[PDB]
Amino acid sequence: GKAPRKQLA
Amino acid sequence: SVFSERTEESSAVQYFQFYGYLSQQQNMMQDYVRTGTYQRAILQNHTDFKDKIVLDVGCGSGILSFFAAQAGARKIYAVEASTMAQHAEVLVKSNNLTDRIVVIPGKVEEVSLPEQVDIIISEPMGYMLFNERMLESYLHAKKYLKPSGNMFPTIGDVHLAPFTDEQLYMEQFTKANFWYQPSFHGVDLSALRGAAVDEYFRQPVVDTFDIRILMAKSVKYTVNFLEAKEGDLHRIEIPFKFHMLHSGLVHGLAFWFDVAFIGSIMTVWLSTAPTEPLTHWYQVRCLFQSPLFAKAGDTLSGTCLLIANKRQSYDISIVAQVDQTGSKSSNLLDLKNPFFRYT
Amino acid sequence: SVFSERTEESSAVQYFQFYGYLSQQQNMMQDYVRTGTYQRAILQNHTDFKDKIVLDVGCGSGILSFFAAQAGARKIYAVEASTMAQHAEVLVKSNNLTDRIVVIPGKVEEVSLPEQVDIIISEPMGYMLFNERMLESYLHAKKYLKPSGNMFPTIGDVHLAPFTDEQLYMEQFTKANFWYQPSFHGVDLSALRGAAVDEYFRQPVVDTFDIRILMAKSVKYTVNFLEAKEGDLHRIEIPFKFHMLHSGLVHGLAFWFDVAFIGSIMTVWLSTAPTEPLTHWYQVRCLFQSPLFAKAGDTLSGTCLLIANKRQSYDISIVAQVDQTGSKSSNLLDLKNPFFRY
Numbered sequence A: 001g002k003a004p005r006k007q008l009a
Numbered sequence B: 001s002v003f004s005e006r007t008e009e010s011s012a013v014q015y016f017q018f019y020g021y022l023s024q025q026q027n028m029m030q031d032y033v034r035t036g037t038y039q040r041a042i043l044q045n046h047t048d049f050k051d052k053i054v055l056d057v058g059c060g061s062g063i064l065s066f067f068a069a070q071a072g073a074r075k076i077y078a079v080e081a082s083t084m085a086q087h088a089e090v091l092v093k094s095n096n097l098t099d100r101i102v103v104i105p106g107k108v109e110e111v112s113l114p115e116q117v118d119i120i121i122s123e124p125m126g127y128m129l130f131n132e133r134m135l136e137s138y139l140h141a142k143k144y145l146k147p148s149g150n151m152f153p154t155i156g157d158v159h160l161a162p163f164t165d166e167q168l169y170m171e172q173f174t175k176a177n178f179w180y181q182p183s184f185h186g187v188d189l190s191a192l193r194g195a196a197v198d199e200y201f202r203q204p205v206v207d208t209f210d211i212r213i214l215m216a217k218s219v220k221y222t223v224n225f226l227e228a229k230e231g232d233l234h235r236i237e238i239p240f241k242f243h244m245l246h247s248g249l250v251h252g253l254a255f256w257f258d259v260a261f262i263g264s265i266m267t268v269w270l271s272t273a274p275t276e277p278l279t280h281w282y283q284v285r286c287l288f289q290s291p292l293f294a295k296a297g298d299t300l301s302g303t304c305l306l307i308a309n310k311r312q313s314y315d316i317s318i319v320a321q322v323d324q325t326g327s328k329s330s331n332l333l334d335l336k337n338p339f340f341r342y343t
Numbered sequence C: 001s002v003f004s005e006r007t008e009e010s011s012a013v014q015y016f017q018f019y020g021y022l023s024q025q026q027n028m029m030q031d032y033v034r035t036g037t038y039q040r041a042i043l044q045n046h047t048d049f050k051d052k053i054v055l056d057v058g059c060g061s062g063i064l065s066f067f068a069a070q071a072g073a074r075k076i077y078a079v080e081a082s083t084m085a086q087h088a089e090v091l092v093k094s095n096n097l098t099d100r101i102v103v104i105p106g107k108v109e110e111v112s113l114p115e116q117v118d119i120i121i122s123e124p125m126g127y128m129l130f131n132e133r134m135l136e137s138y139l140h141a142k143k144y145l146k147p148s149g150n151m152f153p154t155i156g157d158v159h160l161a162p163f164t165d166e167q168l169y170m171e172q173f174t175k176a177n178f179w180y181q182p183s184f185h186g187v188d189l190s191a192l193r194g195a196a197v198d199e200y201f202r203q204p205v206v207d208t209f210d211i212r213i214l215m216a217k218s219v220k221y222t223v224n225f226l227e228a229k230e231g232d233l234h235r236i237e238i239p240f241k242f243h244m245l246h247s248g249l250v251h252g253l254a255f256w257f258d259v260a261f262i263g264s265i266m267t268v269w270l271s272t273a274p275t276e277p278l279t280h281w282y283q284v285r286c287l288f289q290s291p292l293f294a295k296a297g298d299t300l301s302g303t304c305l306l307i308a309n310k311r312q313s314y315d316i317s318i319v320a321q322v323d324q325t326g327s328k329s330s331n332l333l334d335l336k337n338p339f340f341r342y
């Protein structure tokens, strides 16, 4: 996918 | 090479462009549960690293190698395919560890190591565990592993469980109903509404949720990283039979994963479950096209079939039925194109 | 073709994949300022469409071709390169306009039209106007345009202006200062400080803001689509000399754009200015790594340079200096990878 790792707060 | 055989060139470019950003490495690093647990697992099992030879598969910033160096590793080989390898090298020099940490730019299955290793460390887990297909690169690195050598982490459990989320389900048709109007600036858009619905259902939903939506104990599918081969992950059949703990409409399957670092001193767990504090992996949910009514006591059975593709991800095929009623549903989802909902 | 020469084919796959998704067509369509202004431009200038041959460059869902048909167009060639072309043809059938709208799948640089057209319509504007490089495809399409044929939109203005936003600057600075840590889980990251600042400030910031953050009257750079050649958008040089109206720290340059549909009945403007209602383009701000101090009455002079790249975007270089003190700021930004702050 485009951003394989998703952003964490 | 093996990687280039199974991976489209353009998928690979984009993939290593992504991990080439310091901001993305940072995002992973500041996941305290992730980075903290990895450090804790490496240091508490100091006997596994003391004066040993280590391989870091996809070192990124080098963080995990530095944790190995903190535990007393003699030599640590740090492999990284993206341009992050340059930045990793800068940190090795600046932390006075050029003698102990060696940084090798290139893909783990294309580069050559001087020597074999006692233990391999990596963080290759994507969301729903398998996304990115880095587990295969991890398993492939056992060609450099000495016999009786260890893997950190050593196993991975993917968990599946049925959920009820009536609002998540209905939201899909709310969004798609944009197209159901006879005069959008004079244009009848309604012929595309069905196509819009199909599009939204193809997306797994990456976010977290209250555990109260879960209708049964999870079923786990285990991968032992010491035993498994690359080929085991080309087609992953996960059968399930849920003993339903609650009654209601089942709208899909919720996914998460844990991994274990089985060391000599102790066994440390890194969990991404919805009962634990949030990680950057969140959790993943795949909706059924049609909900299924289930009673507490019933058995909801079926298969989650993950078929690997050359875009470093999987086509998800989910089939499920309530055994007592015959009522059944399915869906086809695209793991590489998830809807990020906790945004 | 002219397209594949300037475009890395990996970038082209992504780009047209993105526009194959109905959700993304919906996103543009729901921008009522965008869609409503386009419809108004076409319907209010109905004489420029009545019984005319039209080209719609990158029709997507076909929405603009339907407006051209509403305004009395005889024939409309709706060119679209993504798989959205399929869905457009479905809508042409379901709306009973098979006799008037003709979907032509393919890249506008590659397809063949059976005749020349009286007017080209399109919506090729990206962030900062120029991102995506679709203006070149729009200009390229003039090879199908009859002598004295019209372009909708006809012209495009890019506005740039200096701004002060302490909170924005610090937000990005704080992110980059993660890499200033001497002991992140026992590890010294501080050697990567500079690289981190470089990386973060390479990202343009896409969101909206209050106009009070602007410290000078904006500079306007105009592209006339009737005149411009697609080669004119490979290297865009925009010199600026701002007369500062407020004293304070200049944290960067803010960008927006307007386009004008110059028709035979009236001229209609679509603006993405911070003074105007919000569009899906928002506005774009390019941060300096270190802000420049300026007094009211000073002149901030320099050059914004847009160099087209092969990932359908631009590498932005902004050199700026305060003339009174000689305080100087050089910056390189990657328009392809912006930070969506909103």
Ligand SMILES: Nc1ncnc2c1ncn2[C@@H]1O[C@H](C[C@@H](N)CC[C@H](N)C(=O)O)[C@@H](O)[C@H]1O
Binding pocket: B003, B016, B019, B020, B025, B028, B029, B057, B058, B059, B060, B061, B062, B063, B064, B079, B080, B081, B082, B084, B106, B107, B108, B109, B122, B123, B124, B125, B134, B137
């Ligand atoms: N086949 C491969 N060969 C070498 N490196 C890879 C490969 N596949 C993925 N990677 C890298 O592995 C890293 C995976 C990260 N999740 C781990 C980063 C770092 N080790 C950390 O724990 O913070 C990314 O930086 C990728 O660029």
Ligand SMILES: Nc1ncnc2c1ncn2[C@@H]1O[C@H](C[C@@H](N)CC[C@H](N)C(=O)O)[C@@H](O)[C@H]1O
Binding pocket: C003, C016, C019, C028, C029, C057, C058, C059, C060, C061, C062, C063, C064, C079, C080, C081, C082, C084, C106, C107, C108, C109, C122, C123, C124, C125, C134, C137
């Ligand atoms: N070179 C090209 N040839 C054909 N179509 C293109 C090209 N470049 C971009 N496009 C398409 O142009 C569309 C750009 C959209 N902003 C416009 C959509 C639609 N015309 C609307 O006004 O809603 C996308 O659907 C792209 O796929």
